[PDB]
């Protein structure tokens with residue numbers, strides 16, 4: 484059972500799962516139960532699926548089990564605030580996609596894998612890791628007793644894997660820039676229509692980006708602690724790059740730590756602030772995410788100024 488104090492807190496966008504590690508599997512079950520009913524999946528199947536998903540996140544500093552549940556929780560808060568707008572299969576597909584979105588991540592970006600001719604880059608040309616994370620999701624669903632979508636029809640089973648596949652591919656940041664530009668135009672003119680499937684996929688796509696970057700929408704002490712974990716992974720990539728005779732970008736160079744506040748400032752102005760601004764225009768109840776992002780942009784502007 485979930486403690487009473489958490490039941491109120493889990494609904495809010497700023498909830499930090501950080502302090503409840505032993506409760507993360509149960510928090511995911513509670514979010515699924517609240518989002519699509521107590522008989523959303525056969526409980527025994529769901530629990531085996533969750534533990535296998537947990538076992539398939541590596542012990543890397545950032546793209547680990549904790550990140551998967553953080554992203555899942557952010558999606559739950561979007562779905563709890565945007566009732567009736569999402570179908571039952573979408574609510575169901577999106578929570579699973581979020582838990583699985585970074586499965587079997589090795590702490591290396593697509594650029595490294597594409598630059599050092601890694602076997603995964605030969606198999607998957609673009610969105611290299613995201614195509615591997617989707618493959619890991621399908622392999623897990625196909626394990627004995629792990630098929631949580633057994634109750635669905637053929638038509639429904641193939642729809643949910645498609646919601647999941649597009650959702651996991653939308654977590655490739657390289658695709659975010661164009662997707663947000665198209666949504667921004669559609670909204671400003673008045674073309675945006677959620678009944679059109681292509682628009683829906685785009686709206687879901689940006690929700691996946693919002694969820695995946697939600698460490699920038701927590702209270703400042705949490706945002707700062709997560710950033711140290713992201714950088715430990717980025718700096719470990721840059722160290723391998725140095726060993727292979729390639730000077731890494733500043734963001735992955737541990738000798739360039741002093742550029743972090745300015746790098747953070749640019750990531751908020753170019754990536755995160757526009758993401759949550761566009762999301763807020765389409766889904767007004769998601770406003771707390773933009774407000775929290777703005778509060779952390781102000782904290783980074785304070786670090787650079789010397790406050």
Ligand SMILES: [Mg+2]
Pocket residue numbers: 584585654655
């Ligand atoms: Mg990812």
Ligand SMILES: [Zn+2]
Pocket residue numbers: 550554584585654695
């Ligand atoms: Zn992620």
